[PDB]
Amino acid sequence: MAVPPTYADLGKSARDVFTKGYGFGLIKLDLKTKSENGLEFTSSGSANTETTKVNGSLETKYRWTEYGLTFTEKWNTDNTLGTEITVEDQLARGLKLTFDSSFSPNTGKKNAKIKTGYKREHINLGCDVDFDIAGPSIRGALVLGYEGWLAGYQMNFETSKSRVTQSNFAVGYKTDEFQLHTNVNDGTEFGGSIYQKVNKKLETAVNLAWTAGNSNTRFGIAAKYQVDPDACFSAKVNNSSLIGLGYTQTLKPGIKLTLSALLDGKNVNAGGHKLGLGLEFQA
Template sequence: MNYTDTVGMVTDYAILWVCFICRFIPSFLKNVIFVAYLQQQRQFKRADISPFVYVTDRMAVPPAYSDLGKAAKDIFSKGYGFGIVKLDLKTKSQNGVEFNTSGSTNTDTGKAGGSLETKYKMKDLGLSLNQKWNTDNKLTTEVSVEDQLAQGLKLALDTSFVPNTAKKSGKLKTGYKRDFVNVSCDIDFEGPVVHSAAVLGYEGWLLGYQMAFDTAKSKLVQNNFALGYKAGDFQLHTNVNDGADYGGSVYQKVSDQLETAVTLAWTSGSNNTRFGVAAKYQLDKDASVSAKVNNASLIGVGYTQCLRPGVKLTLSALIDGKNFSTGGHKVGLGFELEA
C-alpha cells in the first residue's frame, strides 16, 4: 500500500467516525447528563424520585455475552429468509408441554429439512426439559434447573446423540446472574474445552469477556472482548475477537415505528472492511417492512404481515446490486402458525 492509498484510507475512516459522532453522540450525552441529574436529585430529594432511583440503583441484569448488540443483530436478521421456503408451527398442550415444529426447503439446492422440539417446565421445581430431533437424525436433550440452589444460578446438562454414527456428545452448562453481573461457564466433554464468559454492567455501560480453553492442549483457543453502552432507545456495541477481528454496531429507535442499525467489521491484515445499514418500519400493529444494504451492494428487503392472530406471513428478497441484470437474486417465503 503506497502513501496515497494510506492517506485516502485514513481520510475515509475519519469521515466515517465524524459522521458517527455527529449523529449519535448528542443522544448519548443527553442520557449521561440525565443520569447525572438523577443522581444529584437522589442526594437531596430521594423521596421525590424514589421509584425511578430504585430502578437506577438496581440496574437490570446485564445480558449474556452472546446477546451483546442483539438489538442491532435483530434488525439485520429478523424478517428475512433468502432462498428458503419455511413453515413454523407452535402449539401448547393443556398440561403445559410446548411443541415447535419447523420445516424448510432451499430453493437453490432443493434440500429439505425439518425439526421437532418439545419443551416442558416444572415451575415449582425450577426444572426445564427440552428435547429436539431433526431430519439429520440428531437427537438433543437439555435438562436445566434454575433458582433452586441459589437465586440466579442455573445448571444444565446438554447431550446429543446421532443413531446412524453412534456419535455422542455432552456439555455441562452453568450460569449465574444478578444485578450488575452475568457470568457463565460451560464444559464440553468432547474436547474437553471450557467456555466461559462474563458481562459487567453499570448505569448503561457494559463490559464483556469471553474465552475458551482447551484443557487437552493447555491452550487458549478463544479470547474476545466487548464494550457497549445502552440507554433507552440507543445502543452501542464494540468487540475484538482474538485480537484480529474488530466489529461494532449502533442501534437506535428513532420513533415508535422506525428502528435503525449500523454495523462495521474489519479484520487485521486485510483491507476488506464490511459495512451495513438496516432499518425496520412498523406500518401498523400487524405489518412491518425491513430493508438492509451492505458494502458488497447486496440489498435485502422484507415484508411481514400478521394475517390473523397466530398466523404470520413473511416475504423477503435479496438483490445483487452489482449484477442486477444477470440474475442470481433470491426470494424467500415464511409462514408462522401458533395455536
C-alpha cells in the first residue's frame, strides 16, 4: 500500500489497457493450472499466421510457501532450457533473491542471472546482475514513494565497455482509480501516460511518446469495458491511424476465447487486416 511498485512496474496499468485482450496475427493456445502451494504449470502454443511458424513453451513451478521458496523450470521449442530459484521474505520481510540459469544446446550459449529486490514503506530497490559471457552487466533501480507521488531512477552498467548504457528517470502519481506516469529514457525518449478506472466496468488509458530532436509525437487512446462478468470488450486507436479491437468471451468456466482484429485506418475500406484468436484454458 505505502509500498511502491518496482521501476519496471511504473505505468503498468496503462500499458495493460493497451496490451491485454489483444493477440494480433496469432493463434494462441494457453493451458494454465493453479495452486496456492506446490505444483502448477503453464503450457503455451503460438502460431504466427504470417510466417506459419509454430512456437511452444512449458513452465513448471513449485512453491514451497513454508519457506518463501519458488522453483521454476522453463522449456521452449527452440530447446531453450531455464531454471529459476527465488527466495522471498526469508532473511528480511520485503527481501527477494533470485538465482536464474539458462542454456541453449542449439547455440551452446549459457546464461546466468542474479536478481535482488528490497521493498518496504516508501521504497522499492532492485539490483540485477547478468553474468553474460560478453561480460557482466548490472541493472539498478530505485523507486521512492511520497503521498501517492512516485519518483524512480534506473540504470544499467556494462563492465566490458565499463560504461553506463542506460539511464532512465520516471515520475508519477498513483491511486487505485487514477495513475499518472511520465518517464524519460537516456535523456532522449519521453513517455507519459494516464490511467483511469472510470467505474467498475470501464478503464481508460492515454499514452504519449516523443523523441528529442524530432518534432513528431505519438499518442494512443484505449479502453477496456467489462460488459458482463463473462465478457470484456477492448478498443484502441493511435495517431498512426491504427485501430485495435478485441473481444473476450468466457465460453465455459475456466475457458476464455479472445478474438482480435487490427485495422489500418488509412484503408479500412478493404486491405490487409491482422486477425487474432486466443484460447485460454484454466485449471
